[PDB]
Short mmCIF file of C-alpha atoms in Angstrom, two decimals:
data_model
loop_
_atom_site.label_atom_id
_atom_site.label_comp_id
_atom_site.label_asym_id
_atom_site.label_seq_id
_atom_site.Cartn_x
_atom_site.Cartn_y
_atom_site.Cartn_z
CA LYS A 1 0.00 0.00 0.00
CA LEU A 2 0.99 3.64 -0.44
CA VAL A 3 1.84 4.75 3.09
CA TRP A 4 3.07 8.31 2.42
CA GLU A 5 3.52 10.66 -0.51
CA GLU A 6 5.03 14.09 -0.91
CA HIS A 7 3.24 15.58 -3.94
CA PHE A 8 4.94 18.99 -3.62
CA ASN A 9 1.55 20.52 -4.44
CA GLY A 10 1.49 23.13 -1.67
CA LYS A 11 2.29 26.83 -2.04
CA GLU A 12 5.27 26.26 0.22
CA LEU A 13 7.38 23.40 1.52
CA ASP A 14 5.60 21.69 4.41
CA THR A 15 7.93 22.24 7.39
CA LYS A 16 5.95 19.76 9.47
CA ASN A 17 7.57 17.16 7.21
CA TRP A 18 10.76 18.95 6.05
CA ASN A 19 13.80 20.58 7.62
CA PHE A 20 16.22 22.95 6.00
CA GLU A 21 19.91 22.33 6.38
CA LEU A 22 21.55 25.73 5.95
CA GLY A 23 24.86 27.48 5.46
CA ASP A 24 28.38 26.23 4.91
CA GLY A 25 28.19 23.02 6.96
CA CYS A 26 30.77 24.12 9.56
CA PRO A 27 32.28 22.66 11.62
CA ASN A 28 31.95 20.08 8.85
CA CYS A 29 32.75 22.95 6.47
CA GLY A 30 31.85 22.34 2.83
CA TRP A 31 29.43 19.60 3.88
CA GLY A 32 32.01 16.84 4.03
CA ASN A 33 33.22 17.27 0.46
CA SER A 34 34.70 20.77 0.38
CA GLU A 35 31.66 22.08 -1.54
CA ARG A 36 31.15 25.63 -2.79
CA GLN A 37 27.50 26.36 -1.94
CA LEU A 38 25.78 27.94 0.99
CA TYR A 39 22.44 26.29 1.49
CA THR A 40 19.52 28.69 1.95
CA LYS A 41 15.75 28.92 2.37
CA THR A 42 15.58 31.23 -0.63
CA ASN A 43 16.80 28.98 -3.47
CA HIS A 44 13.67 26.87 -3.96
CA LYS A 45 10.09 27.34 -5.14
CA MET A 46 6.92 25.29 -5.50
CA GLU A 47 5.91 25.50 -9.15
CA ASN A 48 3.45 23.48 -11.25
CA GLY A 49 3.35 20.64 -8.72
CA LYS A 50 7.15 20.40 -8.51
CA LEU A 51 9.73 21.30 -5.93
CA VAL A 52 12.22 23.35 -7.95
CA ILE A 53 15.66 23.88 -6.47
CA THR A 54 17.83 26.45 -8.23
CA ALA A 55 21.62 26.55 -8.02
CA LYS A 56 22.84 30.14 -8.41
CA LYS A 57 26.07 32.07 -8.59
CA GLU A 58 26.07 35.67 -7.33
CA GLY A 59 29.50 37.25 -7.30
CA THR A 60 31.67 34.48 -5.92
CA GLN A 61 28.86 33.18 -3.70
CA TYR A 62 27.14 29.95 -4.71
CA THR A 63 23.74 29.03 -3.25
CA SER A 64 21.37 26.09 -3.35
CA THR A 65 18.91 24.05 -1.25
CA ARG A 66 19.25 21.05 1.06
CA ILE A 67 16.19 19.66 2.84
CA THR A 68 15.58 16.55 4.95
CA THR A 69 12.73 14.75 6.66
CA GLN A 70 14.84 13.93 9.74
CA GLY A 71 12.67 13.36 12.82
CA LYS A 72 9.53 14.16 10.80
CA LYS A 73 8.97 11.51 8.12
CA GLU A 74 10.97 8.32 8.62
CA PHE A 75 10.46 4.81 7.23
CA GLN A 76 11.89 1.32 7.65
CA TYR A 77 11.72 -0.77 4.44
CA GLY A 78 9.50 -0.23 1.43
CA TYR A 79 9.38 0.58 -2.23
CA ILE A 80 10.46 4.21 -2.35
CA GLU A 81 10.21 6.17 -5.63
CA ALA A 82 11.03 9.70 -6.75
CA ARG A 83 10.24 11.35 -10.07
CA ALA A 84 12.70 14.07 -11.00
CA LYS A 85 14.33 16.17 -13.72
CA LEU A 86 18.08 16.86 -13.57
CA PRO A 87 20.14 20.04 -13.68
CA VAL A 88 22.96 19.87 -16.22
CA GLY A 89 26.54 21.04 -16.50
CA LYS A 90 30.03 20.58 -15.14
CA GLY A 91 30.16 20.98 -11.36
CA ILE A 92 26.51 20.35 -10.48
CA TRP A 93 25.58 17.47 -8.13
CA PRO A 94 21.87 16.83 -7.50
CA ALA A 95 20.90 14.06 -5.11
CA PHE A 96 17.94 12.25 -3.56
CA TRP A 97 19.08 9.96 -0.78
CA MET A 98 18.52 8.64 2.76
CA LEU A 99 20.30 8.57 6.13
CA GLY A 100 19.84 6.28 9.12
CA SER A 101 17.61 7.54 11.92
CA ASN A 102 20.28 6.87 14.55
CA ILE A 103 22.76 9.33 12.99
CA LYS A 104 22.60 11.64 16.02
CA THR A 105 23.80 8.86 18.34
CA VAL A 106 26.12 6.78 16.14
CA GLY A 107 27.14 9.31 13.48
CA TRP A 108 27.98 8.79 9.81
CA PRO A 109 28.90 6.33 8.39
CA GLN A 110 27.71 3.90 11.09
CA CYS A 111 24.15 5.15 10.63
CA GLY A 112 24.15 4.08 6.99
CA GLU A 113 23.31 5.94 3.79
CA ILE A 114 21.25 5.06 0.69
CA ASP A 115 22.01 6.99 -2.51
CA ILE A 116 19.02 6.73 -4.81
CA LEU A 117 19.28 9.61 -7.31
CA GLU A 118 22.92 10.60 -7.87
CA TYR A 119 24.18 12.52 -10.88
CA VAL A 120 27.23 14.66 -11.45
CA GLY A 121 26.94 17.00 -14.39
CA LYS A 122 30.64 16.56 -15.17
CA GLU A 123 29.75 13.01 -16.26
CA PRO A 124 26.71 13.24 -18.55
CA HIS A 125 24.55 10.21 -19.32
CA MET A 126 25.50 8.42 -16.08
CA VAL A 127 23.79 7.89 -12.73
CA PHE A 128 25.11 6.30 -9.55
CA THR A 129 23.37 4.11 -6.96
CA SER A 130 25.29 3.47 -3.74
CA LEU A 131 25.45 2.53 -0.07
CA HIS A 132 27.70 4.01 2.61
CA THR A 133 28.29 2.07 5.83
CA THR A 134 31.07 1.45 8.34
CA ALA A 135 32.16 -1.46 6.14
CA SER A 136 32.44 0.76 3.03
CA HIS A 137 31.99 4.54 2.86
CA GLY A 138 33.21 7.61 1.00
CA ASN A 139 34.84 5.87 -1.93
CA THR A 140 32.41 3.06 -1.32
CA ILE A 141 32.73 -0.22 -3.16
CA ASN A 142 28.97 -0.77 -2.87
CA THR A 143 28.09 1.32 -5.86
CA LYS A 144 27.04 0.98 -9.47
CA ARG A 145 27.46 3.38 -12.38
CA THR A 146 24.62 3.07 -14.90
CA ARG A 147 24.78 4.50 -18.38
CA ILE A 148 21.59 6.19 -19.58
CA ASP A 149 22.07 8.53 -22.55
CA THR A 150 18.60 10.03 -22.15
CA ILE A 151 18.81 10.81 -18.42
CA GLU A 152 19.09 14.58 -18.93
CA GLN A 153 15.86 14.57 -20.99
CA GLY A 154 12.59 15.10 -19.12
CA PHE A 155 11.60 13.35 -15.89
CA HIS A 156 12.84 9.91 -14.81
CA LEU A 157 12.04 7.55 -11.95
CA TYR A 158 14.56 6.68 -9.25
CA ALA A 159 13.60 4.01 -6.74
CA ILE A 160 14.64 1.39 -4.21
CA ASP A 161 13.00 -1.78 -2.98
CA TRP A 162 14.27 -2.08 0.55
CA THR A 163 13.77 -5.15 2.73
CA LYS A 164 15.48 -6.77 5.70
CA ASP A 165 17.42 -8.95 3.25
CA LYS A 166 18.35 -6.74 0.31
CA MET A 167 18.44 -3.34 -1.34
CA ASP A 168 17.33 -3.16 -5.00
CA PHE A 169 17.81 0.03 -7.03
CA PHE A 170 15.66 0.96 -10.06
CA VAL A 171 15.83 3.61 -12.71
CA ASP A 172 12.75 3.95 -14.91
CA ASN A 173 11.58 0.66 -13.39
CA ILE A 174 14.73 -1.19 -14.51
CA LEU A 175 16.66 -3.01 -11.77
CA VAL A 176 20.18 -1.59 -12.07
CA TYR A 177 21.89 -2.63 -8.83
CA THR A 178 21.36 -5.01 -5.91
CA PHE A 179 23.11 -5.07 -2.53
CA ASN A 180 22.48 -8.27 -0.60
CA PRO A 181 25.31 -9.21 1.73
CA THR A 182 25.12 -12.63 3.38
CA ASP A 183 26.79 -11.24 6.51
CA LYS A 184 24.50 -8.61 7.99
CA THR A 185 26.38 -7.12 10.93
CA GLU A 186 25.53 -3.48 11.72
CA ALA A 187 28.84 -2.48 10.11
CA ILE A 188 27.78 -4.09 6.83
CA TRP A 189 24.03 -3.60 7.17
CA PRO A 190 22.78 -0.65 9.22
CA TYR A 191 19.52 -0.88 7.27
CA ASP A 192 17.17 -2.46 9.83
CA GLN A 193 16.08 0.90 11.23
CA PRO A 194 14.04 3.86 10.01
CA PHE A 195 15.74 6.21 7.54
CA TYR A 196 14.95 9.81 6.54
CA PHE A 197 15.05 11.59 3.16
CA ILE A 198 17.43 14.23 1.86
CA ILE A 199 17.04 16.28 -1.33
CA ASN A 200 19.88 18.61 -2.25
CA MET A 201 21.95 20.10 -5.02
CA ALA A 202 25.65 20.63 -4.34
CA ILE A 203 28.19 22.61 -6.39
CA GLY A 204 31.79 21.53 -6.95
CA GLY A 205 33.77 19.83 -4.22
CA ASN A 206 35.48 16.48 -3.85
CA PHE A 207 32.76 14.53 -5.65
CA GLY A 208 30.80 16.97 -7.79
CA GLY A 209 33.90 18.83 -8.88
CA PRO A 210 36.31 20.22 -8.19
CA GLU A 211 35.91 22.03 -11.52
CA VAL A 212 32.81 24.16 -11.97
CA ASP A 213 31.65 25.69 -15.26
CA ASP A 214 30.25 29.00 -14.04
CA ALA A 215 28.41 29.56 -17.33
CA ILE A 216 25.88 26.87 -16.37
CA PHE A 217 24.18 28.91 -13.64
CA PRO A 218 21.37 29.11 -12.83
CA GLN A 219 20.42 25.41 -12.87
CA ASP A 220 17.13 23.79 -11.84
CA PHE A 221 16.67 20.43 -10.09
CA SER A 222 12.94 19.58 -10.18
CA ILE A 223 11.26 16.93 -8.05
CA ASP A 224 7.63 15.91 -8.76
CA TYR A 225 7.11 13.51 -5.87
CA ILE A 226 8.40 11.00 -3.35
CA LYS A 227 6.15 7.94 -2.85
CA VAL A 228 6.61 5.31 -0.15
CA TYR A 229 4.98 1.89 -0.43
CA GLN A 230 4.93 -0.78 2.31
CA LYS B 1 23.57 8.28 -39.17
CA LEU B 2 20.43 6.23 -39.67
CA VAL B 3 21.40 3.75 -42.37
CA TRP B 4 18.24 1.61 -42.57
CA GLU B 5 14.86 1.49 -40.93
CA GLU B 6 11.97 -0.91 -41.13
CA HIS B 7 8.90 1.22 -40.35
CA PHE B 8 6.38 -1.57 -40.97
CA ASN B 9 4.18 1.03 -42.68
CA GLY B 10 3.25 -1.07 -45.71
CA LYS B 11 0.05 -3.01 -46.30
CA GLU B 12 2.24 -6.10 -46.43
CA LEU B 13 5.65 -7.30 -45.30
CA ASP B 14 8.36 -6.25 -47.79
CA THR B 15 9.79 -9.52 -49.09
CA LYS B 16 12.66 -7.63 -50.71
CA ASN B 17 13.90 -7.27 -47.13
CA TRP B 18 12.23 -10.19 -45.31
CA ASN B 19 12.05 -13.97 -45.61
CA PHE B 20 9.48 -16.19 -44.00
CA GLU B 21 10.73 -19.18 -42.11
CA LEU B 22 7.96 -21.77 -42.16
CA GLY B 23 6.77 -25.05 -40.74
CA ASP B 24 8.34 -27.21 -38.05
CA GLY B 25 11.98 -26.25 -38.65
CA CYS B 26 13.38 -29.45 -40.16
CA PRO B 27 16.05 -30.54 -40.42
CA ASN B 28 16.25 -28.50 -37.17
CA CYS B 29 12.93 -30.14 -36.27
CA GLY B 30 10.80 -28.52 -33.55
CA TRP B 31 13.06 -25.51 -34.12
CA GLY B 32 15.66 -27.29 -32.04
CA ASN B 33 13.70 -27.64 -28.81
CA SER B 34 10.32 -29.33 -29.31
CA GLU B 35 8.49 -26.08 -29.97
CA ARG B 36 4.79 -26.57 -30.66
CA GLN B 37 4.09 -24.06 -33.43
CA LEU B 38 4.16 -24.25 -37.17
CA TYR B 39 5.28 -20.92 -38.56
CA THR B 40 3.00 -19.60 -41.31
CA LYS B 41 2.38 -16.69 -43.67
CA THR B 42 -1.06 -16.10 -42.18
CA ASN B 43 -0.29 -15.25 -38.55
CA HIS B 44 0.88 -11.69 -39.08
CA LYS B 45 -0.68 -8.41 -40.14
CA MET B 46 0.38 -4.83 -40.72
CA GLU B 47 -1.81 -2.69 -38.50
CA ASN B 48 -1.54 0.99 -37.52
CA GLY B 49 2.13 1.10 -38.49
CA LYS B 50 3.03 -2.03 -36.50
CA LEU B 51 3.93 -5.55 -37.49
CA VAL B 52 1.52 -7.63 -35.41
CA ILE B 53 2.35 -11.33 -34.99
CA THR B 54 -0.42 -13.40 -33.47
CA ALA B 55 0.09 -16.70 -31.69
CA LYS B 56 -2.95 -18.93 -32.23
CA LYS B 57 -4.23 -22.33 -31.23
CA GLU B 58 -6.71 -23.94 -33.63
CA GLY B 59 -7.64 -27.49 -32.74
CA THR B 60 -4.37 -28.85 -31.42
CA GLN B 61 -2.39 -26.91 -34.05
CA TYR B 62 -0.38 -23.94 -32.84
CA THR B 63 0.71 -21.24 -35.28
CA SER B 64 2.84 -18.13 -35.29
CA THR B 65 5.28 -16.09 -37.43
CA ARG B 66 9.06 -16.21 -37.91
CA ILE B 67 10.73 -13.78 -40.35
CA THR B 68 14.36 -12.96 -41.13
CA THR B 69 16.39 -10.54 -43.21
CA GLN B 70 18.93 -13.24 -44.17
CA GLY B 71 20.66 -12.42 -47.49
CA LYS B 72 18.55 -9.26 -47.83
CA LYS B 73 19.37 -6.78 -45.07
CA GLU B 74 22.59 -7.47 -43.18
CA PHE B 75 24.75 -5.17 -41.06
CA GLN B 76 28.18 -5.29 -39.40
CA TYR B 77 28.32 -3.11 -36.24
CA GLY B 78 26.01 -0.26 -35.32
CA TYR B 79 23.42 0.96 -32.86
CA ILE B 80 20.40 -1.23 -33.49
CA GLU B 81 17.06 -0.48 -31.86
CA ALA B 82 13.60 -2.06 -31.92
CA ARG B 83 10.39 -0.73 -30.39
CA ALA B 84 7.97 -3.49 -29.41
CA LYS B 85 5.01 -4.53 -27.26
CA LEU B 86 5.00 -8.00 -25.66
CA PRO B 87 2.57 -10.89 -25.76
CA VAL B 88 1.78 -12.27 -22.30
CA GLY B 89 1.23 -15.65 -20.69
CA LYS B 90 2.73 -19.02 -19.80
CA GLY B 91 4.29 -20.73 -22.81
CA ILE B 92 4.84 -17.69 -25.03
CA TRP B 93 8.35 -16.73 -26.25
CA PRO B 94 8.72 -13.59 -28.40
CA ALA B 95 12.19 -12.68 -29.68
CA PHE B 96 14.09 -10.09 -31.73
CA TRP B 97 17.60 -11.27 -32.42
CA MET B 98 20.43 -11.75 -34.88
CA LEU B 99 22.46 -14.55 -36.50
CA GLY B 100 25.87 -14.42 -38.22
CA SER B 101 25.84 -14.12 -42.02
CA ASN B 102 28.09 -17.19 -42.45
CA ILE B 103 25.56 -19.54 -40.82
CA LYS B 104 25.07 -21.55 -44.02
CA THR B 105 28.81 -22.29 -44.27
CA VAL B 106 29.82 -22.62 -40.59
CA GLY B 107 26.50 -23.42 -38.89
CA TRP B 108 25.22 -22.51 -35.42
CA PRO B 109 26.73 -21.78 -32.96
CA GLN B 110 29.95 -20.96 -34.83
CA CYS B 111 28.17 -18.19 -36.77
CA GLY B 112 27.26 -16.40 -33.55
CA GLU B 113 23.92 -15.19 -32.19
CA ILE B 114 22.86 -11.89 -30.55
CA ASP B 115 19.66 -11.99 -28.43
CA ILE B 116 18.30 -8.46 -28.12
CA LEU B 117 14.61 -8.78 -27.14
CA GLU B 118 13.97 -12.01 -25.22
CA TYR B 119 10.98 -12.65 -23.00
CA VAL B 120 9.33 -15.82 -21.77
CA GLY B 121 5.77 -15.35 -20.59
CA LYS B 122 6.24 -18.02 -17.92
CA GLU B 123 8.59 -15.53 -16.19
CA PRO B 124 6.81 -12.16 -16.10
CA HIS B 125 8.69 -8.90 -15.43
CA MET B 126 11.98 -10.27 -16.74
CA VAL B 127 13.89 -9.91 -20.01
CA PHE B 128 17.11 -11.59 -21.16
CA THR B 129 20.05 -10.38 -23.29
CA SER B 130 22.53 -13.00 -24.51
CA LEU B 131 25.21 -14.17 -26.90
CA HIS B 132 25.67 -17.68 -28.26
CA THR B 133 29.00 -18.67 -29.78
CA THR B 134 31.14 -21.77 -30.15
CA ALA B 135 32.82 -20.88 -26.83
CA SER B 136 29.49 -20.56 -24.97
CA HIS B 137 26.08 -21.60 -26.28
CA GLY B 138 22.86 -23.26 -25.17
CA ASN B 139 23.24 -22.67 -21.47
CA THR B 140 25.41 -19.69 -22.37
CA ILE B 141 27.37 -17.86 -19.69
CA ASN B 142 27.19 -14.65 -21.71
CA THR B 143 23.75 -13.64 -20.63
CA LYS B 144 21.99 -11.23 -18.27
CA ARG B 145 18.53 -11.37 -16.71
CA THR B 146 17.04 -7.92 -16.16
CA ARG B 147 14.05 -7.28 -13.90
CA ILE B 148 11.54 -4.77 -15.25
CA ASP B 149 8.12 -4.90 -13.59
CA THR B 150 6.54 -2.69 -16.27
CA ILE B 151 7.82 -4.59 -19.31
CA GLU B 152 4.36 -6.03 -20.16
CA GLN B 153 2.92 -2.50 -20.25
CA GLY B 154 2.97 -0.66 -23.57
CA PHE B 155 5.95 -0.39 -25.91
CA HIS B 156 9.59 -0.57 -24.85
CA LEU B 157 12.96 -0.11 -26.58
CA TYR B 158 15.41 -2.97 -27.00
CA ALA B 159 18.82 -2.14 -28.42
CA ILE B 160 22.48 -2.99 -28.88
CA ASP B 161 25.56 -0.94 -29.52
CA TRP B 162 27.84 -3.25 -31.43
CA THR B 163 31.46 -2.47 -32.27
CA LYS B 164 34.58 -4.50 -33.06
CA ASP B 165 35.43 -4.30 -29.36
CA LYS B 166 32.21 -4.75 -27.46
CA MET B 167 28.53 -5.55 -27.38
CA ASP B 168 26.36 -3.26 -25.19
CA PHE B 169 22.68 -4.06 -24.55
CA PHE B 170 20.03 -1.41 -23.67
CA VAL B 171 16.42 -1.60 -22.55
CA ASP B 172 14.53 1.73 -22.59
CA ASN B 173 17.93 3.44 -23.09
CA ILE B 174 19.42 1.91 -19.93
CA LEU B 175 22.64 -0.08 -20.37
CA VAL B 176 21.85 -3.49 -18.86
CA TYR B 177 24.63 -5.80 -20.10
CA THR B 178 28.07 -5.59 -21.73
CA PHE B 179 30.08 -8.31 -23.42
CA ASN B 180 33.70 -7.37 -24.08
CA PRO B 181 36.00 -10.41 -24.09
CA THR B 182 39.73 -9.76 -24.07
CA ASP B 183 40.60 -12.78 -26.23
CA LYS B 184 38.60 -12.34 -29.42
CA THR B 185 39.07 -15.67 -31.17
CA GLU B 186 36.34 -16.65 -33.65
CA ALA B 187 34.99 -19.12 -31.08
CA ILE B 188 34.63 -16.34 -28.48
CA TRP B 189 33.89 -13.49 -30.89
CA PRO B 190 32.19 -14.35 -34.20
CA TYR B 191 30.96 -10.75 -34.31
CA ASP B 192 33.28 -9.19 -36.91
CA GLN B 193 30.97 -10.07 -39.82
CA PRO B 194 27.52 -8.98 -41.01
CA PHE B 195 24.53 -10.31 -39.08
CA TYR B 196 20.87 -10.58 -40.08
CA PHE B 197 17.63 -10.03 -38.14
CA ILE B 198 15.04 -12.53 -36.88
CA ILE B 199 11.65 -11.69 -35.39
CA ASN B 200 9.54 -14.57 -34.10
CA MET B 201 7.18 -15.79 -31.47
CA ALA B 202 7.56 -19.38 -30.34
CA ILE B 203 4.98 -21.41 -28.41
CA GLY B 204 6.06 -23.92 -25.83
CA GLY B 205 9.12 -26.03 -26.29
CA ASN B 206 11.88 -26.58 -23.80
CA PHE B 207 12.91 -22.96 -23.29
CA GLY B 208 9.63 -21.05 -23.53
CA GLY B 209 7.81 -23.98 -21.98
CA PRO B 210 7.36 -26.84 -22.08
CA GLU B 211 4.13 -26.05 -20.24
CA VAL B 212 1.66 -23.90 -22.18
CA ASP B 213 -1.46 -22.20 -20.78
CA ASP B 214 -3.89 -22.63 -23.69
CA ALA B 215 -6.28 -20.03 -22.27
CA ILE B 216 -3.90 -17.23 -23.27
CA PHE B 217 -4.42 -17.58 -27.03
CA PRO B 218 -4.56 -15.56 -29.12
CA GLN B 219 -1.57 -13.40 -28.14
CA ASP B 220 -0.11 -10.46 -30.08
CA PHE B 221 3.59 -9.49 -30.38
CA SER B 222 3.71 -6.01 -31.96
CA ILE B 223 6.82 -4.42 -33.46
CA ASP B 224 6.79 -0.73 -34.39
CA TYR B 225 10.21 -0.54 -36.01
CA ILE B 226 13.81 -1.64 -36.36
CA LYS B 227 16.36 1.16 -36.74
CA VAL B 228 20.04 0.74 -37.64
CA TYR B 229 22.54 3.53 -37.01
CA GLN B 230 26.22 3.54 -38.10
#
């Protein structure tokens, strides 16, 4: 059954379900990857049933949006699907992903991370689906690069089927990657707990950059919905 | 550039480009695996710009269509794409695939085989992409099963990008399988020659069956086009 959906149909982001993460990330400055943007509450809009996040450059200041459902909308297992349209260009890094609910007591990477929509504009026609855990994080080995030459065109679907036994990743309903370790310690498998959502668009940094083509700005990352089935 | 396209826009199949393969397959009797159908010239129609192949059961006689471009339209390398809608049900086996031009002098499997659209109705929500060669054939190791829960819905794209160095397979523009052997002997890599097309729909037999649900008939396999780019 459909247990929760964010339709992004309101006039504003529903802060009963969403948090903003704001600024430069300090003391984890640059948000863990030496990124250029300050995150704000003034870089997004609700338009035509979409959340639209815009990456901007003003002077030498870069700005964007990062929102989470931490402590507000959390789920353990399910078929989780987002419909979204990508920004394009060298240096941009849009993402839709999840973090373990226990992050405030065990930290990252022990809490676990699920990377569902991952695209870096410096590598067109590719998406990434990944896990970060104590066993493998940062330059994680639990990752798959999927070639899709049409991914920049229109809206696509990004999803996971998440159970106690495995994590399946889908793009446009095609299974592209499966993580199913036989040994499910917490270090390998922190995924038997609730997780929360993050939507963001980073600029430059250790993963999205470091090179940024400043001619690309402004760039829009548009999200139609998040659906959760259980 | 687009070098050839079959639009299926005629009132009839163009026999300047297509052959019928007919009957029970002898001397490859039962089409090599006890398939039930006789292939005919009366199980297909051109309708609304699609080739529509219909699998029928009349009495205890099963019929369908099998057509090839052998000796008429053959290509070596390229991006090759078909748009098609699947038949459904236990026992059905639609296919769009290719065989090596030298098959009448070297036989199968030495000639090589490329399986581009492969679906067995007894296994819904799955497609297969495969190669058969002297080095690996029958229960070939060069194969990939791809889960796609929507594959029975509407039309989908099935494609290969074929070069002297590798064979990439795509479903709905997503790269699902790559074959790139390092040792390209003729046994491992019969793919540096022209190949021709086959479209067919088998009924029963040891791969698509052997069990057949007779309530499913008639079933339609619809092909919108084949495009070849070089």
